[PDB]
Ligand SMILES: O=C(Nc1ccc2n[nH]c(-c3ccncc3)c2c1)[C@@H]1CCN(CC(=O)N2CCN(c3ccc(-c4ncccn4)cc3)CC2)C1
């Protein structure tokens with residue numbers, strides 16, 4: 001039917017006439033992602049429909065995604081090509097964000113096949129190369145995991161989903177034991193459960209280490225079944241924290257919890273991953289340190305021997321400038337966040 005609003009799994013994707021021939025890709029709490037044909041550029045693209053305006057938290061994640069991705073430009077970070085929304089604030093219920101179409105994601109890929117060492121190494125390199133750019137703006141991704149790493153048919157990898165992203169804020173990292181956390185459980189560093197809000201760059205390095213382990217074995221390394229179980233999973237492999245590491249934890253409840261557990265020595269990575277490359281395991285070891293202060297940085301990780309075929313600091317760019325997001329943004333009413341989303345999307349108007 002000419003001028004029809006196309007439906008994707010019962011959801012209207014009102015993106016014509018520029019974009020048509022919508023096909024479902026996937027969905028989540030965020031909304032739904034589809035592919036479409038772009039009649040201007042004459043190519044298929046990804047378009048996601050986000051409808052966040054009923055809740056302040058959904059609006060925070062939407063604004064954060066937009067504000068970061070409109071500024072970032074890097075080969076290993078997904079961009080924004082276009083954004084569609086209504087011409088007035090009152091009419092705007094949906095934001096459609098158009099992005100490059102990729103072939104798959106690392107979650108799908110790791111369910112489908114074992115990767116060669118070459119592919120593990122090269123995917124790792126690209127994750128780190130993207131993360132160097134992200135960290136250079138003092139941005140923390142905070143939700144790295146296989147489903148947020150998009151891959152095309154030439155094995156190019158792009159990092160996506162900046163809804164939980166924040167700025168490095170070591171002054172305010174501290175929190176109590178068992179503080180609720182929004183990012184994906186299996187990729188949470190141990191300190192999230194002990195004393196950390198995840199406001200330092202070490203949070204993302206931990207998640208990368210989890211991703212590397214998962215590329216080595218085709219299963220998540222620390223699949224906790226609930227919040228505290230995640231910490232227990234971690235401690236089952238890393239073993240009991242040393243006295244020095246315990247002395248960096250002054251939360252009484254965290255300390256007393258850790259000190260009640262059975263004494264256990266670190267499980268050797270070579271025993272967990274007996275067919276993996278020794279250099280990959282060395283780098284894994286450096287990423288999955290219990291103490292975040294001792295954890296490898298992104299630049300150090302790029303320079304690690306495992307990555308030597310690809311490492312090229314003349315070809316690993318950084319951001320123009322760091323970003324700032326004040327905590328007081330998190331307290332703005334949702335209609336104020338809506339106004340900001342309206343402003344940020346204005347330069348893609350009209351449709
Ligand atoms: O960017 C994202 N996905 C993309 C992108 C480009 C793609 N090209 N090709 C593919 C592809 C993937 C797999 N297989 C083949 C092809 C792409 C996938 C994801 C989808 C969503 N996105 C983040 C995002 O749009 N925001 C952060 C979360 N936020 C948000 C989060 C939660 C809620 C929420 N709403 C209701 C209940 C609970 N939470 C609302 C908004 C909206 C903004 C990351």
Ligand SMILES: [Cl-]
Pocket residue numbers: 194195248249250251
């Ligand atoms: Cl502490």
